[PDB]
Structure formats: C-alpha cells, structure tokens
Structure 1
C-alpha cells in the first residue's frame, strides 16, 4: 500500500480514530489535510506528520456548514493540487433513551455524522469528477451501522444512514472513477471508557472485568478492544486498492462483533 503523490482529507482528525488514519495515510506517502473544528488541534497532528518527514496541513472546518466545507475542501485542493481521498469521520456520541432524547441533540447528531458526510462528499466530488480523475471516499461508520444498542438511537440512526449514502455514491461515482467504502470499527478503548467501566460496575453490581468482558466486549469473539491501528490499516488498504472492486462495501473491524 503506497500513496505517494496522493492527496487526502480526513475530517474529525484532531484526535482518536481520525488522527490515526491521518497519520497512517501520511506515513504511506499521502499529502494529508487534517480537518477539524479546532485549527490548533488539526495543526498539532499536521505538525507531528511534518516532523516525521511526511506532508500535512491543518484545516479548520465546521463540517455541518456548507460554506465552511466548500471553502475548506477547495483550499486543500489549491494547496495540494487535488483531493484523491476523503475520509469522513465523526465520533460524537450523546446517549439517552428515545422518550427522553432531546430533538436538539438528535439534530446535532445527524448534522455532524451525516450532513458532514454529505457536504464533504459533495465538495470532494467537485474535484474528483473533474475529467473523471477519480477518487476514494470513505465514511467512518461503526458496528452500529449494522446493529443497534439501547440509548444510542441518534448515533445508530446516523451510522445506518451512512451506509445508504455510501452505497448510492458507489453507483453514481463509478462512471467518474470514484469509489466509496464504509469502515465500521468496534469498541475502541478510550479515556472515557476507562471511566465508564468502574461506574457501570458499581451501578450493575458486577466486577469491572465482567463489565469489560461481558457488557462491553461480550459480542466480540475474543474480549479484545478494537485499536485505532486496526482501523487505520483497513482504511489504508482501501485507500490504496488498485481497482474499484471493493466499492460500495462496508468493512467491520470489530473482533467478531456482528459478522457479515
């Protein structure tokens, strides 16, 4: 997998999965624009890449805003000459049962996860469709693109929706040499998780080990957290694939949680 001469935009990439994707794509030779609401956050990642010998810039962008997305993607295209790869990535999670789920929270969840994917896609296609130069568009989904959990109606709905948009893009983008994919990570261990574990142990009245192995990773086959590296490697594989053979497909990266 080599991306020398390629240009990539990764959104929500100041941290976590999106940051590791950015790092991995740059390592592979891609020139990478790290887009995030926080320009300083984006810059820190870009600075890490440049220090390691790669090529990156940080781009401030509210992905729910058409104007900010269009301008920012065009800025990338101007700096780098193209946009070969778009990775649309958001991780914001707001939980609540449906009967208590705020409509404001609901709308913000759809806007960030899905409108952000729609807008950045639309903006990237303006450049990818030019003379059918082509491109790869990857949405970061979840096992929750495929399977539900209680208290996560907004997130599960959004992640399900991302599959539909990607599948339409695969049929529309083919004649312009644009491929689409969805990558669906399982449970990643975070500082938040580290705090949620003892909480749920006390509330449920079981051990923290049972919270990890049975509550959180009970649907995995091995009781192992998914790593950002797992995810980034799969994105790299897709980004560098030599044909459109995998277009429209989703890839579940979850240690056996939901098997398709």
Structure 2
C-alpha cells in the first residue's frame, strides 16, 4: 500500500506535544525513522523514547528552529543516524492575536519564527532529499493564513506567507523530486456546532492522518496545496 512510509527518514519539528507529537508517532508507526525536534530538549527526547518503546526507530534533540547552528545540527543528526532525509515536517511555529500598534520586534519575530525558519530548514533539507531520489515537505500552517480578522497583523500575514511560500517553492523543488504542501488545522482537543459542520472538535490524530497521506507515496503527484483539516469549518 502506498499509504505507508517504508524506508523513510522524517524530521518533525516542534514535536514535543499536540500535532507535532502525533505526527511523529504516526509516521514511525507507518515505517519512518523519525528525528524528533523541539525547542525543549527533554520534550523531544521524551517523544523519541516513547516511539522507541513502542517498537519504532527515532532520536530526539533540541532545536530552536530560528538558530542556524541548531538547524544544521538537526540535518547532521538525521544523516549521521539514519543515512538520508526524505521527509520534513515543519511544525514549529507560534504567535497569536496582537494589537495593530505592536512593537516592530513582535511583527518581525512572527516572520522569523513562522516563515524564515521553515524556509531555511527546507533549503537545508532539499539537497539531501534530492540525492535520496525525492521527498516530501509538509508545512503546518494556520487557518489564520486565509482568514481576515482583527489583531491578526503579524500572525495572519506570516501564516499567509507560509501558505504562499508552499505554493511557490513547489515550483522550485519539484524538479528535484520534492513535493511541498501545507495543512491548516482547526481547533483540536488536548460554539463548535455553529462553526463546525461535523459538530465535534478535532483530534491531533486527524491532523496526523492528513499529514501521513500528504507525505506518503499515495500523494506522490500532489504538490503546492494547502489542505484545511477543520471539520468543514471556515473560521476558528
């Protein structure tokens, strides 16, 4: 079945908890060797160890994705341990509502954290992906990227840039055998009836299932897409 990740090597960032942790565990059950990263060293190591106690292959390390030496260390740890890189899940990111008059450093930080970090990690991963014969990049974006609301100057615009980066670099890396897609997740457990047609909150496993599809051979001809996983909802 093409819905497995047999012989894959996947880097999953911001994976100590929630969506990132569920993607890491799901990818390992699907056959990937997983390089789990998180801003907190203990959080990444906890997830990698839980994957190993479940029978999977995984290592965990600290990675501030806004730090170039940390980014390079992750690439090198994946190659040193597992020999190649074929999947990259950019799940690290952050931000939220802020006033229009926010300090300029807050606005610029949203772009460093949500956008510059995953563009650079994609640059770093792409040549290894190419040498391995292809790969998949998955960006975890936000529904704010396509909505319009108050207090969204930095969060909405930086996530919109993530969506549009996804669509454009699909053109650049397609010739290297690399696909690039994004998921925008609705609200997940850790008002709904009127906003959410399917009438329930989402689960982290719902996001991870869509992530597995998009990173698997079953999606080998899908690139440049933003997939909203939100129970049919259009607003958060």
- TM-score under structure 1 normalisation? 0.84
Give the Cα separation in 2 of the matches to 1:92 and 1:173: 26
Q: What does residue 220 of structure 2 align with?
A: 244
Q: Gaps (5+ residues) in structure 1?
A: 191-211
Task: Decide which structure has greater helix share.
Answer: 1
Bigger Rg over Cα = 1
Question: 1 or 2 for the larger relative contact order (CA 8 Å, sep ≥6)?
Answer: 2
The SS at the match of 2:195 is: coil
Q: CA deviation at 1:103?
A: 1.9
Q: Which runs of 5+ in 2 are unaligned?
A: none
Which sits farther off after the overlay, 69-78 or 11-20?
69-78
Please list the CA deviations of residues 149-186 of structure 1 after superposition, one character each: whole Å capped at 9, or x if unmatched: 32232211111111121112211111111001111101
1:186 paired residue number: 186
Residue of structure 1 equivalent to 2:148: 148
Q: How many Å apart are 1:91 and its aligned residue?
A: 4.5
Q: d(CA) in 2 for partners of 1:219 and 1:255?
A: 9
Structure 1 runs, 4 residues or longer, greater than 4 Å off: none
State the 1:31 CA deviation.
0.3
Counterpart contact for 1:64–1:119, Cα < 8 Å: no
Q: TM-score, normalised by structure 2?
A: 0.92
User: Could you say which residue in structure 2 is the equivalent of 1:123?
Assistant: 124
**Per-residue deviation, 1:76:** 1.0
Aligned counterpart for 2:50 among listed residues 26, 48, 53: 48
Single out whichever of 53-62 and 150-159 deviates more from structure 2.
150-159
The question of whether the paired residues in 1 share the 8 Å contact of 2:135 and 2:178 is answered with: yes
